[PDB]
Structures are given as C-alpha cells and as structure tokens.
Design an enzyme around this catalytic site. Structure first.
Site, PDB file in Angstrom:
ATOM      1  N   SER A  26       0.802  -1.220  -0.117  1.00 38.19           N
ATOM      2  CA  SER A  26       0.015   0.050   0.149  1.00 38.19           C
ATOM      3  C   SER A  26       0.837   1.387   0.043  1.00 38.19           C
ATOM      4  O   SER A  26       1.778   1.478   0.623  1.00 38.19           O
ATOM      5  CB  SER A  26      -0.819   0.123   1.243  1.00 38.19           C
ATOM      6  OG  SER A  26      -1.879  -1.018   0.964  1.00 38.19           O
ATOM      7  N   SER A 104       2.161  -7.196   1.448  1.00 40.56           N
ATOM      8  CA  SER A 104       1.114  -6.471   2.005  1.00 40.56           C
ATOM      9  C   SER A 104      -0.217  -6.567   1.218  1.00 40.56           C
ATOM     10  O   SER A 104      -0.681  -7.573   1.001  1.00 40.56           O
ATOM     11  CB  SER A 104       1.375  -5.065   2.504  1.00 40.56           C
ATOM     12  OG  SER A 104       0.643  -4.530   3.353  1.00 40.56           O
ATOM     13  N   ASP A 159       3.589  -8.932  13.413  1.00 43.58           N
ATOM     14  CA  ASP A 159       3.275  -8.277  12.184  1.00 43.58           C
ATOM     15  C   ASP A 159       1.661  -8.732  12.260  1.00 43.58           C
ATOM     16  O   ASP A 159       1.095  -9.752  11.988  1.00 43.58           O
ATOM     17  CB  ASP A 159       3.692  -8.739  10.976  1.00 43.58           C
ATOM     18  CG  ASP A 159       3.058  -8.074   9.668  1.00 43.58           C
ATOM     19  OD1 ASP A 159       2.299  -7.124  10.002  1.00 43.58           O
ATOM     20  OD2 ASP A 159       3.710  -8.112   8.626  1.00 43.58           O
ATOM     21  N   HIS A 172       5.620  -5.004  10.242  1.00 40.53           N
ATOM     22  CA  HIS A 172       5.286  -5.026   8.841  1.00 40.53           C
ATOM     23  C   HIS A 172       6.220  -4.496   7.961  1.00 40.53           C
ATOM     24  O   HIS A 172       6.202  -4.841   6.754  1.00 40.53           O
ATOM     25  CB  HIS A 172       3.836  -4.441   8.835  1.00 40.53           C
ATOM     26  CG  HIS A 172       3.015  -4.560   7.603  1.00 40.53           C
ATOM     27  ND1 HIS A 172       2.854  -5.926   7.331  1.00 40.53           N
ATOM     28  CD2 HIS A 172       2.526  -3.711   6.676  1.00 40.53           C
ATOM     29  CE1 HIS A 172       2.040  -5.597   6.097  1.00 40.53           C
ATOM     30  NE2 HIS A 172       1.781  -4.549   5.752  1.00 40.53           N
TER      31      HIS A 172
END
Length: 197
Positions: A26, A104, A159, A172
C-alpha cells in the site's frame, strides 16, 4: 529501479526463460515498491539480465490503503489487472516459467489473482512469495487452489496483518532482509527444480 515493465516492453521473438510478476504494498511507488527491486537484482544475477523479465503490477492497481478492507483484501480492478498480466505472459511467452510475489496488499492481490486464474496458467507459476500476507490467518497460510510446496510466506512475529488484523505495526515494515536473501533463494530454487540448470 521501482518501475519495471519487462513483460509489457518485451519482444515476443526473444522471450525470457523466466517471468516474475510482483505486486507492491500500500502507498508504495512505481510498480515494484520497496521490496521488489531487491528481489529483481538477485534474480537477474542468477538467470542473467536477458534470462528473466521483471514485471510489476501497475495500471489499475493503485495500491490504495483503504482497499485492504474490501472482501478479498484488494479491489476487483486490481485483480483484473494482475490476471491480465499472467494472461499476457502466457500468450507472449508460452514456454516461460512464471514466478510471482507480493507484499502486504500486493500479497492479498497475488493470492486473489492466482485463485481466480485459469488452471493451465496457474500451473506454470513455479513458486510464489508473500511478505506480510494480509490474508495469512484467513487462508491458513495458503493461496487457494495453489500447492503449499510452491508457496513461501514471510510473516514476522508481531506483524498484526498476519494475525487477522489490519493494523500496521513496525514488524510489517521489516521485510528487507527476506527480500534480499530467502525470498529470491526460494524463487531460484523452485525455477531450477522444474527447468534444471
């Protein structure tokens, strides 16, 4: 660097033996983001610059943070974009071995695309790597309709997205070492397992 369109730009008359399709996380830049370039460099070292085509998922895939909350962890438009890339690879270079990956939101995207893929094309993906896999718990560490032996998931302790949440914590953002070593190691091994060397 962060943008690679080797498949789209590539000459059909001189197809690479290996085609890597990667989806960024993202808000990341280009079509490779923060982890893709590291993986690409190592693949080029193993197969040679002309031996492998690096292709990021761009186009309709905007890598919008909010899309993590949609049913499949990404938008329908993004899934259509990645499906089209696998389809382009299959048509342009039918004898190439495919490999894929995502980070992700891109990991959810890779999983959704592979699940929807025509089986004849899906079966050409020799190995797939997922970092900070947002659907890890929901999918029990697997990509639907795809074998476990061809899948490698990198989910750091702490995470939260690997544990069913959508909260972004420090672990993360700590996949750099994995992208530089074990991820490309896994991909190279899976390609050599079917292509020989």
């Amino acid at each position: 660097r962060t943008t690679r369109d080797d498949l789209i730009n590539g000459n059909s008359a001189s197809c690479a033996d290996v085609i890597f399709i990667f989806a960024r996380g993202s808000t990341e830049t280009g079509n490779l983001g923060t982890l893709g370039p590291s993986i690409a460099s190592n693949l080029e070292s193993a197969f040679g610059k002309d031996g492998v085509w690096i292709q990021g998922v761009g186009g309709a895939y905007r890598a919008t943070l909010g899309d993590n909350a949609l049913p499949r962890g990404t938008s329908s438009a993004a899934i259509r974009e990645m499906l089209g890339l696998f389809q382009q690879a299959n048509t342009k270079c039918p004898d190439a071995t495919l490999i894929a990956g995502g980070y992700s939101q891109g990991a959810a995207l890779a999983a959704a695309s592979i699940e929807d893929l025509d089986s004849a094309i899906r079966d050409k993906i020799a190995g797939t790597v997922l970092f900070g896999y947002t659907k890890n718990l929901q999918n029990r560490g697997r990509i639907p309709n795809y074998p476990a032996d061809r899948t490698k998931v990198f989910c750091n302790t702490g995470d939260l997205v690997c544990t069913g949440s959508l909260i972004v914590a420090a672990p993360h953002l700590a996949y750099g070492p994995d992208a530089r070593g074990p991820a490309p190691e896994f991909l190279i091994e899976k390609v050599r397992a079917v292509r020989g060397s």
